[PDB]
From a paper:
In addition to the cell cycle-regulating CDKs, the transcriptional kinases Cdk12 and Cdk13 have become the focus of interest as they mediate a variety of functions, including the transition from transcription initiation to elongation and termination, precursor mRNA splicing, and intronic polyadenylation. Similar to Cdk9, kinases Cdk12 and Cdk13 have been shown to affect the regulation of RNA pol II-mediated transcription elongation through their ability to phosphorylate RNA pol II CTD Ser2 residues. In addition to regulating transcription elongation, Cdk12 directly or indirectly affects several cotranscriptional and posttranscriptional processes, including RNA splicing and processing, and DNA damage response (DDR). The small molecule compound SR-4835 was introduced as a potent and selective reversible inhibitor of Cdk12/Cdk13, leading to deficiencies in DNA damage repair that in combination with DNA-damaging agents and poly-ADP ribose polymerase (PARP) inhibitors result in apoptosis of triple negative breast cancer cells.
We determined the crystal structure of the human Cdk12/CycK heterodimer in complex with small molecule inhibitor SR-4835 at 2.68 Å resolution, indicating a specific interaction of the compound with the kinase N-lobe. SR-4835 occupies the adenine-binding pocket of the kinase with its central purine- and pyrazole-moieties, while the dichloro-benzimidazole moiety of the compound sticks out of the ATP-binding pocket and winds around the first β-strand (β1) of the kinase N-lobe. Hydrogen bonds are formed between the backbone amino and carbonyl groups of M816 in Cdk12 with two nitrogen atoms of the central purine moiety. Here, two H-bonds from the hydroxy groups of residues Y815 and D819 form a clamp to the two nitrogen atoms on either side of the benzimidazole ring. From the top, the two catalytic spine residues V741 and A754 of the N-lobe interact with the central purine and benzimidazole groups, a typical feature of type I kinase inhibitors. Residues of the β1-strand and G-loop I733 and G734 interact intensively via hydrophobic interactions with the benzimidazole and morpholino group of SR-4835, respectively. The αC-helix of Cdk12 is indeed turned in by 23° relative to the Cdk12•ADP•AlF3/CycK structure. This rotational twist is accompanied by a downward shift of the G-loop of more than 5 Å, thus occupying the site that would be captured by the terminal phosphate group of ATP in an active kinase. Similar to Cdk2, the αC-helical turn allows formation of salt bridge interactions between the phosphorylated T-loop residues pT893 and arginines R773, R858, and R882. Of the embedding 815YMDxD interaction motif within the hinge region, the key residue Y815 is replaced by a phenylalanine in Cdk7 and Cdk9, rendering these kinases incapable of forming a hydrogen bond via the side chain hydroxy group with the benzimidazole moiety of the compound.
Author numbering:
A (entry chain A): 716 to 1035
B (entry chain B): 22 to 260
Amino acid sequence: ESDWGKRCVDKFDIIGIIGEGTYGQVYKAKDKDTGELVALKKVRLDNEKEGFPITAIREIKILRQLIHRSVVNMKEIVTDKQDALDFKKDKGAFYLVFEYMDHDLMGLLESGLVHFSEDHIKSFMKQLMEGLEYCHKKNFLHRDIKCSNILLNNSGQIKLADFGLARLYNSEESRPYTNKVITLWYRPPELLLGEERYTPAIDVWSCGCILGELFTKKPIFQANLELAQLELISRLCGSPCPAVWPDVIKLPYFNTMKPKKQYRRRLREEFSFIPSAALDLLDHMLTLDPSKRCTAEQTLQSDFLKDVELSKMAPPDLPH
Amino acid sequence: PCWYWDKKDLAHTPSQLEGLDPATEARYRREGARFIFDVGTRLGLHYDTLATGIIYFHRFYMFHSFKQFPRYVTGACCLFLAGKVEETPKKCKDIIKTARSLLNDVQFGQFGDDPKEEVMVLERILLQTIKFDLQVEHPYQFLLKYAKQLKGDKNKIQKLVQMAWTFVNDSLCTTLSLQWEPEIIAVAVMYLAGRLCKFEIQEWTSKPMYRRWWEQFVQDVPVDVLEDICHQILDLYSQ
Ligand SMILES: Cn1cc(-n2cnc3c(NCc4nc5cc(Cl)c(Cl)cc5[nH]4)nc(N4CCOCC4)nc32)cn1
């Protein structure tokens, strides 16, 4: 019950790979003893690269400190192969165990058999920002928010998962952090310009890409490299310039990474089909200047989310 | 999980069962804790990261023997893992370089031909032994929290803290971290520092006549428990 790591992974019956996570693939398994459905993340031990990943240690430390409705709950940790009776030879791995969720947001948007109403988006965005605000209040950055990391059950309950790139941030002091975080399609502009002293505003940007994707059913920034990714962000949110972002000259890659033109902001006209209450939220979440970008607590106070009573939530039906 | 044993259990550790007399194991625990404290200090590591590795060290040899695992190799692995836990990570090559500077070449021989591999390998069974319970609290945060509520002579209170702070450093060499919670150890080092300084700690509290001043910080802690902890700390200076 309390002796984690002792239990062997052969006590689980791996069914199949269900997706690609932070540090490896995600497996779907059934406990051979409890019959419960779980998800497994395999952590590797490089032994020639500081051993057990600190990113895995961060996710273990953080997920054993969080208890919330919209967050994933790590169940236990099991070991791969029993040690050859000289432990100096055992070179296996460990498996983080999680609760299994019925749906992921990536597969729902890709199918086309599902269509989310306005109340469905108001419910999903409410739970996502309530979970992100609780982590920011606890001084934890997700640093990797995408559609495959957002899970959904049949009861309409949203949970945020895959904290493989999470870490603690200093709330009352600036600190240098890791730059190469967040997937390219959801990475904020400041990270594309090489900012290492960023704020929790990087996760709000990714959630801003989720909100716009919930209406278009397609990622809004799809590029194959860092320069082309900054190009697509500039053509919609405007080019990063000191007028919209005075602190942009302090960034290392400001003069290195430059779009073809100095595009204006065409966000409000491109998403005109979006309801007015959601467009005001989308415009504020996709602000170039992270200091002028809204926080997680501010999103819950916006007109699109302040009056969204989560209870009596009606989820869409895509059945057998 | 429960990480606290009795004194009767501390006399029957895996090392005791394999023939090692209690005098030498207590010495290896002191040498191991002194090693982690000296290596991390030279690396400029935060005081919580030092105590975390030492707690990993004491907790390790409650399930494994000193005869199978060298103390300085395990002590190195504890400090390496502790840095990644407390977000103060140090390269393993930097810990080995600091270890070979302090340890004799005979003592450093425990790492074998490949000192880096010997520590990375031990990390697998170290995590299993600690049961992946990485978050560990130390008496420092409670020593500061309790003493900050004390109103009185700013000099006498400051001398009380810097003296109890030294006592917590000395308590890491003993199995006190395996007997009583950090809140209790934090109260105990205050009780000891108040005796040698001839300070009446109860006069700096809301109840100046109530002799058991610590009941506002911890609940249901008799005086004999504090006396037991003070006795084990005073045994370090009698040697
Ligand atoms: C890190 N972490 C993850 C979880 N977690 C729990 N539940 C699921 C889950 N359940 C719906 C689901 N989606 C599926 C897609 C396929 Cl193709 C198949 Cl065959 C079966 C599927 N089932 N999906 C996923 N992934 C979605 C894809 O990208 C990676 C994450 N992660 C999950 C817990 N912690």
